[PDB]
Design a protein around this nucleic acid. Sequence first.
RNA 1: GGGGGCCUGACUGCGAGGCCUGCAAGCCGAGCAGGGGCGAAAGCCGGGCCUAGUGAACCGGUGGUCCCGUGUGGAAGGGCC
RNA 2: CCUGGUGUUGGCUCUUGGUCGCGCCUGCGUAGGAUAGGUGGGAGCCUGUGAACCCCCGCCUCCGGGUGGGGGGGAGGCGCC
RNA 3: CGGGGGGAACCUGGGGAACUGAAACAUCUCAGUACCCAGAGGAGAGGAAAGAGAAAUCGACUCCCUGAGUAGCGGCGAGCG
RNA 4: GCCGAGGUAGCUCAGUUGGUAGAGCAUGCGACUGAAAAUCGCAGUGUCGGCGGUUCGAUUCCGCUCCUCGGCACCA
Lengths: 148, 228, 71
Amino acid sequence: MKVILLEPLENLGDVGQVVDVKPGYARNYLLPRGLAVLATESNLKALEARIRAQAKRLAERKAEAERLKKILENLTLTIPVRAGETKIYGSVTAKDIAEALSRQHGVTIDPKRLALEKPIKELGEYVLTYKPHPEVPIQLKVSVVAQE
Amino acid sequence: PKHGKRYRALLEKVDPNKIYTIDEAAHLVKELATAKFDETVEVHAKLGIDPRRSDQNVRGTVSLPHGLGKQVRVLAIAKGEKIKEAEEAGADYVGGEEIIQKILDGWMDFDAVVATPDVMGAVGSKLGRILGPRGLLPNPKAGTVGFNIGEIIREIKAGRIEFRNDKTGAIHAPVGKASFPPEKLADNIRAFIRALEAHKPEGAKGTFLRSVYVTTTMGPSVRINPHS
Amino acid sequence: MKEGIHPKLVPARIICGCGNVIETYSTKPEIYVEVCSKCHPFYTGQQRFVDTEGRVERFQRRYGDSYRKGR
RNA sequence: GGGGGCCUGACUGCGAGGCCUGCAAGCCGAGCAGGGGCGAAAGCCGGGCCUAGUGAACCGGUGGUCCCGUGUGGAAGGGCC
RNA sequence: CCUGGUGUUGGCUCUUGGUCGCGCCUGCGUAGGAUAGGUGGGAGCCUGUGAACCCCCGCCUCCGGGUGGGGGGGAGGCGCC
RNA sequence: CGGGGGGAACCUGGGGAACUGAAACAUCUCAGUACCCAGAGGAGAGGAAAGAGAAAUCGACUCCCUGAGUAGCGGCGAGCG
RNA sequence: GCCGAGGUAGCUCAGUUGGUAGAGCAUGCGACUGAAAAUCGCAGUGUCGGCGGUUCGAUUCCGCUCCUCGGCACCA
């Protein structure tokens, strides 16, 4: 009984597999309902279809990632700060970096992620690890200084 | 995960997970145990038979090459001639209707019997009700009765071994002296293989040659393949 | 006919009966049952689209439903 | 028929030729071969002192044999004793 | 008609039996230090208790005692015979 | 658009029986016949080989003669074949 | 015919190393029984259907044999 699962991983744990739930059993008892289907070249393939698909999807993001990680991790990140010769009257929030690099220089990266506990505003420049894609991190050299 | 037998050395030496084979055997057994007085390995094992009908209560032999001189002894029972031939050939205990008499009285030292047909009846009956089934009345079917007593006691001493499945189907015997050449151990091994395979009673019903063990007196133990 | 099969007939005949064995194990026949009989399967249902039935026949069934199930 | 010795023919292959038979049965046997046993040996022994202790054919068993096998090598099954 | 198997006749679940694989563990007839289940090899084994003296404990019952241990330890014991 | 309703006999399938024989009669037998039905025709039926057969060939299907009444089928019997 | 089962002293039950046998009830002798029964004590008392057998040694272990019982299939 090639029970191909949509919402299953045992219980409703979706598209996790395909198992044997005996005749009718599996049939009208667990999947008629509608939590999966049975083999068929149509199905087996279908799986293969969306699987391959995600493969390309993920590989892909990996790629746009690489393009920007490279361009960026290479380039220097400079920014005009406002104050004395340490923390600025204001603060440097990684987001601040965000709009900064983003449209001031070209490439936009979401605020959210990056490595910034307390805004840093000690003025001068720091280079840190701000993760950009899953296990492909983007660390960068952000020199920031009083715009005097 | 720590037991009680310093022998643990030899113990680790062995790794019963494999029944391996005859020769590799000879080798590793030798290598295995030369404790106080170099090894005197032995093979012990059992067959898929049964006690009830004695059609399987086998025993016998097969010289299986290589010299000898000690083990479960015997009585040569016959007449002067045999005294000479069997006695010198290889007979610890030597007599006949004479030794039989002696026995009836109280003297005797022989579980194994070799009575020739010249006092065959003499011993069989005079001592029948003497030796009793402790395995002593020469019975024509156990390398125990016949013409060449000289020959049987002879090899007994020259290079012997015998069969005798104990209580529930096991035999015990030697097939390849201590450190003695591995190949040699292999030879007597297989030799017994056959001897046995032959004695195999027609009343077997399944996997006959069962637990095939080669082990040492006081030493390791593991099965072997009476095959390659 | 109002009782065939749907996916291929099964409403059918049969002549039966018997004897006694022993045969190639000590004896000849043992025969005396000129009798006649019936012979058949089952019935079940599912849905076209929010209204339906099934009817059919056991096996050929399982196959079938799977099939028109494909649509 | 009563007693003792040793022994298996209370044998296979087979029998010419007759009693009685309507069929079938059933009953009689010298004699030839191997082959033994009885006795030294002349000759007896192919169950008993004889006439009653009996059943076709089938179907199926078994111990042989070692003829048949369904394109052929085997085998199930298998033909005759 | 009643009646095992079997197909539609699906989920969860408490549970108990046989049989093998294996580790453990058991073996009390009377003389027998001594509760020998056989049959083998077959005069030694061990020092990881440095030990057989003792300690209590885990265990097994036909009083005894067999067994696995924590410990306490200071050439010793048991096998051999 | 089509059917349907008929038709002596032939056709296909559908379901499908006692006599009588086996001097009884239960397997067996009349037989897949009589007979009820549906349906196609002018004839339907079969009809281009998971065929035949054993030599190294045959070569669609149907109908006739021959093939044997042998191969064979069985209270191996009546018979059927 | 097959399998499961019972068979030992007048009645009936008891053992798996076998390797040593009765036991409860009726039978004989003796206290109690002033009668009785019943009570106790004792005795007597035996092939574990048969046979051999493995088996030292097994009666309960092996194989076959009697009468019995239960439930299948044998004669076509």
